[PDB]
Design a protein around this ligand. Structure first.
Ligand SMILES: [N+]
Ligand SMILES: [N+]
Ligand SMILES: [N+]
Ligand SMILES: [N+]
Ligand SMILES: [N+]
Ligand SMILES: [N+]
Length: 137
């Protein structure tokens, strides 16, 4: 139900040509956060979206992760945020999927990683392999 509403908004990305509207991203993020009880379902849905989506939607999918983790850290506290730790479990595979984006979108991913590193959204042991994966392409 809370997960149904989130899935609905997430998959609605398919109706749009990137870049995605701020208002749409906000709606997806707010739905994720309202559904914090079901954070595992939320993370699983985002990961599935990114695995299966067309190449033009990989960066939008990453922005969904970025938007959820930023809002959750702001709203619940960096130490208490449940989203970044849960996304970390499969993150190497998530990014393997993300890097199968158009070559003109690769820089957008590295930008996100650079900001995550600066703000310590993940520790170096997670961020560095993700940075290494960009360089290896
Ligand atoms: N998808
Ligand atoms: N993309
Ligand atoms: N939290
Ligand atoms: N959280
Ligand atoms: N992930
Ligand atoms: N970021």
């Amino acid at each position: 139900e809370a997960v149904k509403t989130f899935n609905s908004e997430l998959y609605s990305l398919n109706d749009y040509k990137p870049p995605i509207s701020k208002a749409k991203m906000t709606q997806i993020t707010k739905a994720a956060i309202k559904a914090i009880k079901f954070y595992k379902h939320v993370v699983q849905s985002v990961e599935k979206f990114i695995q299966k989506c067309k190449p033009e939607y990989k960066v939008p999918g990453l922005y969904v992760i970025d938007s959820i983790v930023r809002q959750s850290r702001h709203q619940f506290g960096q130490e208490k945020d449940v989203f970044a730790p849960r996304f970390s479990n499969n993150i190497i595979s998530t990014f393997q999927n993300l890097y199968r984006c158009p070559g003109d979108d690769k820089s957008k991913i590295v930008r996100v990683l650079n900001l995550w590193q600066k703000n310590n959204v993940f520790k170096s042991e997670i961020i560095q392999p993700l940075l290494d994966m960009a360089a290896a392409l």
